Structure formats: C-alpha cells, structure tokens
Amino acid sequence: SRKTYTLTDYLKNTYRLKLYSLRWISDHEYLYKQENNILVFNAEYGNSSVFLENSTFDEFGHSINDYSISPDGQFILLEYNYVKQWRHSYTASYDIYDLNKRQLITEERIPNNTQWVTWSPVGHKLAYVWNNDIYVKIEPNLPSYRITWTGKEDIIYNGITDWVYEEEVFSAYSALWWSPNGTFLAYAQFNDTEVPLIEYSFYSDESLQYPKTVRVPYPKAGAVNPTVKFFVVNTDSLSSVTNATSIQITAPASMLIGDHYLCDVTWATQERISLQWLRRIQNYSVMDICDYDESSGRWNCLVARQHIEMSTTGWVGRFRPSEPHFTLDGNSFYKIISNEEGYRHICYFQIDKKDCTFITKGTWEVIGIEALTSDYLYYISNEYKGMPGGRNLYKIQLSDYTKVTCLSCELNPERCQYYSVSFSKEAKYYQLRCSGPGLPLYTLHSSVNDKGLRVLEDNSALDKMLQNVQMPSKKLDFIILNETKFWYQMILPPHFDKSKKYPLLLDVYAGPCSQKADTVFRLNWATYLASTENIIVASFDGRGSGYQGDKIMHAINRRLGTFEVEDQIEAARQFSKMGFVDNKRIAIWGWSYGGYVTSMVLGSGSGVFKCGIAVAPVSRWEYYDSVYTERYMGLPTPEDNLDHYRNSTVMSRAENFKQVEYLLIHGTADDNVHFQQSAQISKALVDVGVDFQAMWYTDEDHGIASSTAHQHIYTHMSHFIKQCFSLP
Amino acid sequence: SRKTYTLTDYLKNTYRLKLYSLRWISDHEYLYKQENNILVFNAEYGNSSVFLENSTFDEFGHSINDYSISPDGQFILLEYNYVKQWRHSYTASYDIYDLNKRQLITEERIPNNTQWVTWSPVGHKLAYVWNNDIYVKIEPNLPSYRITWTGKEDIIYNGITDWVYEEEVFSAYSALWWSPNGTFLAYAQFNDTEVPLIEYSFYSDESLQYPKTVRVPYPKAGAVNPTVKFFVVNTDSLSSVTNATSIQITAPASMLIGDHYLCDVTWATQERISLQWLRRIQNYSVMDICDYDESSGRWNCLVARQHIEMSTTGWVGRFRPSEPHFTLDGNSFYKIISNEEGYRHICYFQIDKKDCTFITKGTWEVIGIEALTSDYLYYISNEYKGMPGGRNLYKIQLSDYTKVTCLSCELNPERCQYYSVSFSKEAKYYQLRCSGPGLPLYTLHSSVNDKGLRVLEDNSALDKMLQNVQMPSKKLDFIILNETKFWYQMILPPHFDKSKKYPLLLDVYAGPCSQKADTVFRLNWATYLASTENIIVASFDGRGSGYQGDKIMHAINRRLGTFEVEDQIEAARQFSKMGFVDNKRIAIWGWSYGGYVTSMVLGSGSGVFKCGIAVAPVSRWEYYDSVYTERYMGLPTPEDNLDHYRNSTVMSRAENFKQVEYLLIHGTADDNVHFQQSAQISKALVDVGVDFQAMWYTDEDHGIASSTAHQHIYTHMSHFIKQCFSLP
Numbered sequence A, B: 001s002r003k004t005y006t007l008t009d010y011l012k013n014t015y016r017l018k019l020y021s022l023r024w025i026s027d028h029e030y031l032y033k034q035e036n037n038i039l040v041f042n043a044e045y046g047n048s049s050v051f052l053e054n055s056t057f058d059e060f061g062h063s064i065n066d067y068s069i070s071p072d073g074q075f076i077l078l079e080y081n082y083v084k085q086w087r088h089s090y091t092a093s094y095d096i097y098d099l100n101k102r103q104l105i106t107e108e109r110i111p112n113n114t115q116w117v118t119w120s121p122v123g124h125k126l127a128y129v130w131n132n133d134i135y136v137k138i139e140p141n142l143p144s145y146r147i148t149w150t151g152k153e154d155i156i157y158n159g160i161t162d163w164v165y166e167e168e169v170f171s172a173y174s175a176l177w178w179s180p181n182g183t184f185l186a187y188a189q190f191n192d193t194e195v196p197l198i199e200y201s202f203y204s205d206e207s208l209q210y211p212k213t214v215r216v217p218y219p220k221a222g223a224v225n226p227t228v229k230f231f232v233v234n235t236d237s238l239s240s241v242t243n244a245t246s247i248q249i250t251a252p253a254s255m256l257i258g259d260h261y262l263c264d265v266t267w268a269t270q271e272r273i274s275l276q277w278l279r280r281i282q283n284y285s286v287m288d289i290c291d292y293d294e295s296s297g298r299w300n301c302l303v304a305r306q307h308i309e310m311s312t313t314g315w316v317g318r319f320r321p322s323e324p325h326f327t328l329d330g331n332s333f334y335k336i337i338s339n340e341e342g343y344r345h346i347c348y349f350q351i352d353k354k355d356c357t358f359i360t361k362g363t364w365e366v367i368g369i370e371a372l373t374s375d376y377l378y379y380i381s382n383e384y385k386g387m388p389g390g391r392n393l394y395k396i397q398l399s400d401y402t403k404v405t406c407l408s409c410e411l412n413p414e415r416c417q418y419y420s421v422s423f424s425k426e427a428k429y430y431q432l433r434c435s436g437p438g439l440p441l442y443t444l445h446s447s448v449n450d451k452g453l454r455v456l457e458d459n460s461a462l463d464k465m466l467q468n469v470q471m472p473s474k475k476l477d478f479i480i481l482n483e484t485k486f487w488y489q490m491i492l493p494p495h496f497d498k499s500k501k502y503p504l505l506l507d508v509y510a511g512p513c514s515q516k517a518d519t520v521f522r523l524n525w526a527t528y529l530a531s532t533e534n535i536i537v538a539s540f541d542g543r544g545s546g547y548q549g550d551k552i553m554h555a556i557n558r559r560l561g562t563f564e565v566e567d568q569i570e571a572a573r574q575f576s577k578m579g580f581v582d583n584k585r586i587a588i589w590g591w592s593y594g595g596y597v598t599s600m601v602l603g604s605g606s607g608v609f610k611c612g613i614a615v616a617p618v619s620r621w622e623y624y625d626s627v628y629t630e631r632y633m634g635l636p637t638p639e640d641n642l643d644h645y646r647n648s649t650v651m652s653r654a655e656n657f658k659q660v661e662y663l664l665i666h667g668t669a670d671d672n673v674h675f676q677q678s679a680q681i682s683k684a685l686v687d688v689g690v691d692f693q694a695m696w697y698t699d700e701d702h703g704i705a706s707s708t709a710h711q712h713i714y715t716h717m718s719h720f721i722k723q724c725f726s727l728p
C-alpha cells in the first residue's frame, strides 16, 4: 500500500540526506553554518556562538557563493560571481571583510576574474592567481607584490595547474603551498607551449549566431605533455617596487633524464619541503627532501636522502604516489606503500635511513592516514570482518604497533560499516561520518579516551519519511572465480521473492582501482529501478578493482579492456544461474570507464546481454589523456604497448553489436572524454550496417549534470530499459 | 505481382532506371559513353563509331574520373585524383592527351590540386584555377600565362566562387566565362576578408588522434557578405615578359550604393557581355549591357541600355533573376519575367528600347527557355491540361506569337507528362527525355519537321522486372481551399482499397518555389513504405510553392514558417476526411527545409500528427546563410524583419513537442545547414523536459550520402515509422 520510490522522487530530490559539514579551526572548535549563520562550536561542551551574523551581507549587493576565514581570525574572504571551468578550476570575484570593524576593505582589492586565492596557514597573509601570475598580500588593505611575470593564457601557468594536472595529478586547480610559518610561498609552474589542443564547439544560448570553438591544451596518449618547474619565495622579504626573488628547486637527475611529473608537495618543517616526482613511465618515483640554507639562502636536496619507490607488478600508488605524513620534528614520516604480499599498508620512514618499517600487515589494506600525534597514528582500513568495501577508523600506539584499536567498528555495527573522519588540530577531537548501510550518522568524539560526545545529525527526519515508502534493500556478498573471492552487490526490489525471476541490470564502472560493491547507503537511479520497476540492479568488482591488493588490482596492467571486461560477463553468467534472475532480460550500463566496459561487453558476442547503455564512453585509449592512460597502458609506440592500444577499441568489435540493443549517449562539450570518442563508435557501427540508438547532449560535459539535462538523460534511459524489459 | 518493393531494393538498387546522357559536340553529332568506351553518334542517320577506346589509358596508372574533349577535337582532358569539396566544388589532377598523335603531354602540365579547368568554347585554349589564381594556356604543351596574383586561400577568390556564391548564386564553382571567339576571358573575383567563419569538428578516420577543425567563410543572415569585382582579359594579347592586363567592369551606380551581388554573366556576342546585379535587399536588379571599344581597349556599359527588374509582392526571379537568351546579333534577348497577373512568362527585349513584349501569357508558367533560332523560340512550360506538375516542350513561331505548337504533349500522353530537352548547337536536333508518370523514355528528333528519329532508351528491361513486383500507384490531384486549387500527390500501396484505413506519412519539403506534387517517376523510400509496409505517402504543395504564379509563391514573403506550415497541417486534415486514412496514424517527415517545416508542424500543438522525423533542419533563420535567407526574410534587424525572425524558430515551440514522438537526425559535418541548428533544437526540448529520439551521423554533410550512412539513416527511419504505426 505505501508508495514506491519513483523516478520523479530521485529526480526532484524528494527524500534528502542531511549533512553536517564542519571546518575545524583549532584543537577544540569548528565552524558550522546553521540557518546560514556561520557559527562556532566548542567541541568539549557543545556550546555555540554566532561567528558571522546571517543578516550581515543582505545589502552587500551580490549572492555570496562561498567564504573563507583567515586562520588567525581577523578577516573573512567573500567569494562571489563564481564561474566554473573544469572539475576543480573556477574563476571568481572576492571582497574582504574586516571583522574587528563592520567594514569591507575598499582599497587594493583582489581583482575580478581571480583564478585562485589562499590565506597563509597562520595570520592573515594572502596569495592569489590572476591572469596566470601569482600575487601576494601581506595585509588585506595594502598593495600586492607581484611574484611572477611570465603568466600567459593556455601557455604559462604559475601557481595554478593546467588541464592534466588539475584532473589527474593534483585533483585541484591550485598549485600553491605556503609554509607553516607563512614565510615561504611554494609554487609550481607549468609550460604547455607544445601541448596540442583538443577543439570543439560550444553552441551556447540561441542568441549566439556563430558557434564558438573551445580550445584546450590537452595532451592525448603519447603526445607532448606539459613540463613543470618548482619554486620557493621568501614572503617576509618583499619590496614595494623591487622584483621578488624566486628560488628554483630542480628535479633530481634521475627524472631530468626524460619526461616526468611533479606529483606531490608537502612541507615538513618551516625549513624543509618534500617533493615527490614521477617518471612519464609511471614505474619510478622519487621523494626529494629539501632543506633551507641559512647561509646561502637556497634549497639543497641531498641525493643520499632521496626515497625511491618502484613497482615491478604495475604502477606506483593507487592513482598517484601516496602522501607522506611527517612527525612534528620533520625527521620521519609515514606513507602507504604496497608490502611484499602486494597489500597497501603503513610504512615508517626515517630520513637519512634507507628501508622503511611496516607497522600494519595482513590481507586487507589501509585506505588513508588521517591524523598523527606523538602517541598515535590514526588510519582508515577495510580490515573489519574481511569486507573490502567497508571502512573503519583505527588507532595504533606508536610504543607498540601490535597495540591497535578499532574506534568505529562497534559504535553501531548494523547501521554503520562505512566511516570517514575529520580530526581537529592536534587530534583532540574527531567527527566521525557513517555513510551506510543505514542512514548516514554524524557524531563527535573526544580523543583522550575515545568517548562519544554527542550526535550531530542522525537523519531522523529522513527515517520518518522513508518508513512510508517501499524501499529496496541491498545485498553485499561474494562469488568465487577461479579460486578467488570477488564481491558484488544487488539492489533488490521490496518484498523480494527468490521463487520469482527478476530482470537484472548490471551497473558497471570497473576502472583501475575502483570499487562498486560496498556498504554505503545511496538514493539513486537504481533505487528507483528496483522500487518501482522491480528490477535487480547489480554491480561487481572484478580483476582490476581496488582495496584488495595488487594481485587483483594490477591484473589488468598494460591491458585495459581485458580481464575487467571478461569478469563482468562471467559475473552476469553467474547471476543468471541464481534461481531468481530471468536470463532473457539481463542488461548492462555505465558511464565513462563504465561506458567503455559496457561497450566492450556489448561487443564481445557473449550472448548474455540483451541490451546496454553507454554514457560518455572512452572508445580508444589513444583518444584519452596521457597521465591516466599511460599509467595503465604505457606508451602507444610499437616499441612499447601499441598493439593492445589497437586491440582494445570499441570500434573493432563493431560487428558484434548487431546481436544487441545499444543506446549511446555523450555530451558535446565534454572536455574530459571527448565527444570524438563516441563519434568514432557510431561511425564504426554505421560502416558495418548496425542499428542502434543515440543521444547527444548539447553543451553538456562529462557529468551531464545541469539540472534539466540530468532529468532528461535519466528519463531517456528509463524509457529504454523499461522497453528492453517489456515493462509498461 | 507477387514479390514486394523492398527496403534493401531501394538501398541496393535492385531495379535501375536506365539513362541516356549524351553530350552534343556540334549541330549533328553527340558523344556517348557506353561502358567506358566513348562513342560518337550522327544524329541525322544514327550511325556511330568509337571515338575513344576504353583501353587507351590502361597503362595510365591512375583511375580516370572524367574527361573533357576540346571543341576542335584535337585534344582531351583526363580528370583524376578527384577530391570533393562542397556541392559543386572539388579539386583534381589533369593530364592532356593529344589525339592526332597518341601522346600524353609531358611539357607544362596542369598542376596538382587544380580547382577548375575549362576549354575555350571554340578551339583548344585552356583556362584553369590553382591556389585561387587564374592561369591560361594557348596550347596544351606550352607554358601557361598567369592572369592574377592576388589569390589567397579562404580570402581572395579569382575565377571561382566562395561558399555562398557557389551554393546560392551560381550553383557552380566556376566563375570564368570565355567569349564565343575565345578571345576574351571574363572572370569574377570575390573577397571574403571580413566574412565570419563557421567552425565545426571533423573527426576523420579512427587513426586521427586529434579532431580537425574545419573553418569556412559563411555569412549567416545579416552578417558581412563577400564583395565582388568583375574583370575581362584579352587572351590574344598575352606575353611572357609583360603581365596580363585585366580590365575591370564596375557595377552600376545603382548597385554601388549599398551591398550587392553579381548574379548572372552571359556573353551576347564576341564584343558584348551581359551582367545582372542584385541588391542585398533582393527586390531590385539591374541588367547591364557592355561593349568592347576597339580603340580604347576598354568596356563601356551605357546606363541607358540598362534594364531594371523590381518585384512589388516579393523577391526577384525564382531562386534568382532569370537568365537572358540573346538573338544571334546581340541586339535583343528573351527572358522570363513575372507578368502583371503574377505569372512567369517570356518577354522580348530590344536592347535600347523601353519595356518588353510578352510573347506568352496565361494562367500557367514557362519553366525555361531551351533554344533560340531565327524562326523559333523553344521553351518548356506547364500549360498542358492545366497541370502545374507536368512539363512539355513548346515551339513559338517568331513571326506570329499566336502560332504555338506543343512538341511533346501528344507523343506518349499516358506515359509521358514531364519532359526535359537538350538541343544540339544551332538546334537542328533535339533529345527528348520524359520522366513520368511512366518509365523514362529518351528520344532523338530533327528540328526541321519536328520528326521522331529513333528511340534512344525505353527502359524495356526495367519494365519487365517491375511487372513481377507489387508496385505502388501514384495519385496526382488537387483540393480546393479558399477559391484556390492546391495540388497533392499520393503514393498508394498495391491493391489499394478505398474501403480500408491506411496509415499516412506526409512527406514534406515546402520551401519557397518548391514542388512536391508532380508527374515524375521515382524509385525511392516512399516506394518501399507503400509497397511493403502499406503506408500511404502524401505530399502537398501549398502556399509558398511554385509554378502557379506569385499569389501562391510570394504568399510567404518575409513570413517563413507560417502559411507553408499551416497549409501542410490543413492538408493532412483534408486527407482524413477522405475515408481511407486512419487518423490515429498520420506522420510527417522532412530534410532541410522539409526538416524545418516538419518540426514546425510537430510543434504547432495541432494534435493532428502522432509522430515525425526531421533530418538536417533549419531551426533558426539567423543560423542559415545570407543570400537565401534574406531573399525571403529581409534583414534580422528591428528596423526590417527581426520580430518574425524570432517568432519563426523551432526552439520556441519546444513545449508542444510533449504531444508527439519526434526523431531528429543531423550530420556533424554539414557545412550548409550547420549541426548547430539541430543542437539548438535538442537543447530546447531538454530545457523544457520533453523526451525525443536523436541520431547524429559523424562526418556526413547535408546529403548524408555516403552509401553506408544512407543505408543507415533510412534503415533507422524505417524502424521509427514502423513502431510509430504499430507495424511489424
């Protein structure tokens, strides 16, 4: 009798997850916005005050898009006129509000169209990027000092990243790193002069008579990539008219030998910086430890003090060399590295000593190091109950590595099995965030004795609303494939009955180091497919998937479009043979890597799938960017991996699509996986005389996330699946 | 007759129409290519021999695309390495083969990537265009003389047209016109400096890592058009030492005022050239008559023999100002003009005298003037039986305009109601070519006592094959709307039965001066829809259509997207009265203008139609080109016609589409109706939440005509109509 979770429920966000986003600002207080007052909370006692009144900025004259408060609390950055670029990059105007006064500063304002801004970690110093050059402000109302002069659109980038670096190396537009003193400003410079450009049309509003051509430096696989330089500027010694001096730190000879990348920047102490560098062949990376010299005024990186990571089995790190977490003095640090068994665990490194010491071990993996104090290192792993898709927070005592406590496993075992955490400064308190399988639960804690302080948001409101609807349930379990455990999940319709046969949709991603079977609670298309259409939606993590060691993750090294595709077919075969799935109605779908796999599956000739939907698929590894592709496939030269680059396109399997109903969708302004990719898929289908369905989304990019497009594509695919499954 | 006309038959051409394409080379011989042998024929007696054996160039090494034989029969041009540009333009390599000898010419060869070649009209001089400049050859083996030096790719065009001029004005690449002597070479020169560029992606073979951006100068409505200059060179007075002397002919002062076009160039005599010009507001045109001054060396155009044409109710001419046919002495010419009742007839003009004399009159129109001799003007009209969609050859005795014979009406009246003609030089012989309603029949005749000589091709073969197929029939008829006749044609399934209800597809074009209802015999898609799928396929010629005078044709002046659209809806309504149509299954489709109308109909909210298909549609007139659009729509400024430009888009009707099932298809490399036009439609249906189907064809242009793409779209449209009509 209750209503079912409908397509329109998902689309209009009728059942919302409540959140509790805070920003720790000290060792015992955080900022939180409530009824859009920016408040401060005292962690120990829960009491709150009003940092910045909701009312303030009513007469400001513009919609304020985000804010940032100076660390040593005398000012606040008001971000407005936000215009978005790529995944992380955006441009914006900024005002500055002086708090010890009811006043916006009116002089020496940060310019409009600013590319990036950042407070120093302490005090109130400002660093920004405009027209691709760096600028520094010592005080909010004074003139800025110009640090670089070489900035040029699409060509020279100072302190911000170019397209590849934003997307694949740093996951940020930013390329600035202040010292903990705020004395030193470090920045990377990127040169893209000889990097080719991907070009495409943007139509814009009807009123535009002629289409625009968007042109972006984008190094496709095996092209000339950008180069990078790294610099450091003393921010305390600057002159109103005399040009600032930037000291350059050079990459180690073992990288300058060829094409390479800056991969990580991390200050250790006020006088030591850590640089991780990675060879274009992503086999070899070097951590450089560089110290400031009182005498010379320069930075020396002792060769004997370098740290090396190699991989014989695949590439380095999960998507990148892991982050190093330094002890307070800067003499040692902790880092995730693959152990001799191939499982990623925490290793202890001392700076002028060579090997490192494993402090965690076993048939699971550490996912991230989240905080370090002199008594404790806190990390998240999937150790609990051997479930690779779970997540908990653990604690190690550094005086005995065997002394390990799990801090989150038993807090709410049935409801919470997927945590993330956010510690105050010095880790005096931590916010725990549970993401499923029940409703998300946010809690606060004290670290001295790991006591539960409160409950910050339990989503009770959601709970009450959901009780009135036929929600689906989720199964997490595993199958065996050739002596190995591989997990899967199913989203089962309500009042599921195993004596009936249900149509099955295989939801697939399957990119390297991905995980599609886990314990998090989601409200999404699948929810609707199952609750209203009684469709089983299934996902499976096969060879190539992550968090279960290298044997499985690297099985696909130098070989995309291979074991990961086979394994999705085999999982389906095995789902077929469960008494409850009708083998006449099995479909497959996915987005991005997911579309490539889905396409490669549909073109395999397996006979197992009736129909599928590929959204924004890669169709040919030579079409995608250099950093991601080569990491998994090497270079597409005959000397290296050209044959497989050629044997693993969707075009080559064009003939087999005659055996299936295929819907191909792609947005036309996709700057990440270019429309070209699906354009070649269709040309290939056409050359061979195969019918299929298509949908381009004008001006949409890789996420197809504009509100109306979003509603449309999911509307379009629901029609498609419904009809594939003879469902009215 | 048992078997059916099948989709594959259409697509694979199981049933070929034979043709008889001949090339006259004198008053009494023609050449004909049978197999690959070139044959020469005698028209009077009908004997024939082999001019060029198919074997001659077996060791040429390159596949020969076409040939052109010098008018004095001494040499032949071989065209190879043919690369297609737009509709008429293309590049190619050329060799010249000396006939009296059997020698290829090795000296001073025509260059690669040549853009246009043409023999003089009498002898064997050559004029070609390479890198946008004109070169002349007196003798095939001698060095060429460079006539222009200003040529610049995409900017200066000497002797060839820019994109608009090629497609909308001359319907040709060529912009060279030899004088009948061969003495003078007259050529146009276009300057596209300020014309904006349409840009679009072209993806090419799979192997291209980066898509190429194609950029073409193309004035969209109301943008900066190209400019034109006209020159005439004396080709008898060229030297190697001195440069060629080009004499410019300026346009009339009444054209120089504002923006204008060069519409027609026609040589009257060895020393007289006729030029027509047209004002950007294409409602006024001026014919200029220019003579060579033997002493001066110049060309003078006496403002006094200027002839003016103005239209009160609309534009000038059908798709342009009609062409003049000059009597041999040059002093007078005949030309089709709209008369005072609004019908297009032949008018006689004497060069220095006012007005002109109409030699034909009546409620019908002359379609073309086909030949002129001392005693007779030959022309084609649609007078016979008052059928606007019929065509016939007529003869008028010049010494008494009331003496008008129909030369074609009674030859084969039940089989032939649509002819075209081709006359030999001096018109002593003519080939008739009938196109329907029966199978095409090609016949040769002598002009003396308009006698039949021979039957050239009667398609007997095709006849018998077709006897064994259940072919559809064709109903050609009319409906009365106000006090006016509007013609439709129906394509009826075999064994038609006026008692049963058939589903109907309205096949629409409906752009200005178009005619969809006629007596032509066609084997096409509609053929299949009727014969195999038992679908009636109807076309209708309403307001804005042509060959019925101006009341009908100009009714849509400055109002595109109105009466032509309404009228198609009304036609389908009328078809429903007629009791053999199922009004729950009426559909509509079109290409180009047809696409535009279909989409405008589908969005009218009319309820009449269930579904439709739009291929390569214009969606906004500001997107299409300047010459065509401004012809019917004026300028898109507030002071001229901007409101209707904005009330006539497909985008604005978007909400209405929820009422129907729509399929939109467009080639990504359409340089004519830019993909932009459908990209904007798709985004508008998306912004308003209307579902629909789509299909882009990568790298195809406005014709989407490569064999595979053609097979695929028609396959895909078949599936669409079939399911729209609940037909298996």
Ligand SMILES: CCCC[C@H]1CN2CCc3cc(OC)c(OC)cc3[C@@H]2C[C@@H]1N
Pocket: A167, A168, A169, A170, A171, A319, A320, A511, A592, A593, A618, A624, A628, A673
């Ligand atoms: C064919 C399309 C594939 C697309 C992207 C997939 N994402 C998601 C996971 C991830 C996670 C990263 O750090 C955690 C990360 O750090 C660079 C990159 C990525 C990749 C980057 C790649 N751009």
Ligand SMILES: CCCC[C@H]1CN2CCc3cc(OC)c(OC)cc3[C@@H]2C[C@@H]1N
Pocket: B167, B168, B169, B170, B171, B319, B511, B592, B593, B618, B624, B628, B673
């Ligand atoms: C909205 C798209 C429609 C575009 C095309 C329509 N055709 C058909 C009729 C026609 C007939 C002509 O001579 C008879 C002609 O001579 C230049 C041009 C045309 C136009 C050219 C214009 N390219």
Ligand SMILES: *[C@@H]1O[C@H](CO)[C@@H](O)[C@H](O)[C@H]1NC(C)=O
Pocket: A040, A041, A042, A045, A047, A048, A049
């Ligand atoms: C919390 O309460 C204590 C006692 O009044 C006070 O000192 C503190 O400032 C309060 N904190 C906030 C952020 O309101």
Ligand SMILES: *[C@@H]1O[C@H](CO)[C@@H](O)[C@H](O)[C@H]1NC(C)=O
Pocket: A035, A036, A037, A054, A055
């Ligand atoms: C402003 O803050 C008050 C104080 O609680 C809150 O109740 C009110 O709803 C907020 N007003 C706005 C602008 O949302």
Ligand SMILES: *[C@@H]1O[C@H](CO)[C@@H](O)[C@H](O)[C@H]1NC(C)=O
Pocket: A093, A109, A110, A111, A112
């Ligand atoms: C930036 O923007 C505002 C309006 O957009 C303008 O008035 C101002 O002068 C510009 N310069 C600033 C604030 O840096």
Ligand SMILES: *[C@@H]1O[C@H](CO)[C@@H](O)[C@H](O)[C@H]1NC(C)=O
Pocket: A150, A156, A191, A192, A193, A194
């Ligand atoms: C960028 O590198 C190019 C070499 O491709 C060089 O010409 C240029 O000087 C470099 N610019 C800077 C500022 O490093």
Ligand SMILES: *[C@@H]1O[C@H](CO)[C@@H](O)[C@H](O)[C@H]1NC(C)=O
Pocket: B040, B041, B042, B045, B047, B048, B049
């Ligand atoms: C036709 O016959 C005449 C007389 O035999 C011959 O001279 C002439 O060359 C022939 N022409 C052709 C093209 O066969």
Ligand SMILES: *[C@@H]1O[C@H](CO)[C@@H](O)[C@H](O)[C@H]1NC(C)=O
Pocket: B093, B109, B110, B111, B112
């Ligand atoms: C044209 O190209 C072909 C191959 O490049 C060559 O044989 C010839 O010499 C070229 N130049 C000409 C024909 O003018």
Ligand SMILES: *[C@@H]1O[C@H](CO)[C@@H](O)[C@H](O)[C@H]1NC(C)=O
Pocket: B150, B156, B191, B192, B193, B194
């Ligand atoms: C073409 O037109 C441009 C723009 O008016 C002008 O400056 C240029 O000289 C012209 N070129 C020629 C060769 O006519």
Ligand SMILES: *[C@@H]1O[C@H](CO)[C@@H](O)[C@H](O)[C@H]1NC(C)=O
Pocket: B149, B241, B242, B243
């Ligand atoms: C020939 O004439 C053109 C312009 O008329 C000039 O640009 C070219 O250099 C000339 N060369 C000679 C041979 O006089």
